[PDB]
Amino acid sequence: SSLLGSIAGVGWTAGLSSFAAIPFAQSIFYRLNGVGITQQVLSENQKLI
Amino acid sequence: SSLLGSIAGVGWTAGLSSFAAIPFAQSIFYRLNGVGITQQVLSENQKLI
Structure with a gap:
């Protein structure tokens, strides 16, 4: 569920993972x-x- | 050890391997x-x- 949270901001990216x-x-x-x-x-x- | 030599120049890249x-x-x-x-x-x- 935190992975579904990070779908949007992490799918941006611009680096994995320092965002968003x-x-x-x-x-x-x-x-x-x-x-x-x-x-x-x-x-x-x-x-x- | 030649791989450690090629860490710097090959990690550039701009192509593997014709450098540097x-x-x-x-x-x-x-x-x-x-x-x-x-x-x-x-x-x-x-x-x-």
């Missing part, structure tokens, strides 16, 4: 921005995803 | 600059580390 507290939604817009390399205009318009 | 001869101190300031992503102003001021 970022909401989970923004963690999946950066995790989604990363390798599904759709940048910000698609995740802005739209979500729902 | 860099002193070990600067190898740990770049290895330390990398993932403990503290950039140059901290390792300058200070060392001791």
Whole structure:
């Protein structure tokens, strides 16, 4: 459960592990921005995803 | 022992292996600059580390 807590902030990264507290939604817009390399205009318009 | 020799220069990298001869101190300031992503102003001021 602390691992699920660290999913969002640790999934950022920028180093394992010296971080963070970022909401989970923004963690999946950066995790989604990363390798599904759709940048910000698609995740802005739209979500729902 | 040749592996300990190649720790410094090979730990640079920029390719394995076609390199190098860099002193070990600067190898740990770049290895330390990398993932403990503290950039140059901290390792300058200070060392001791």
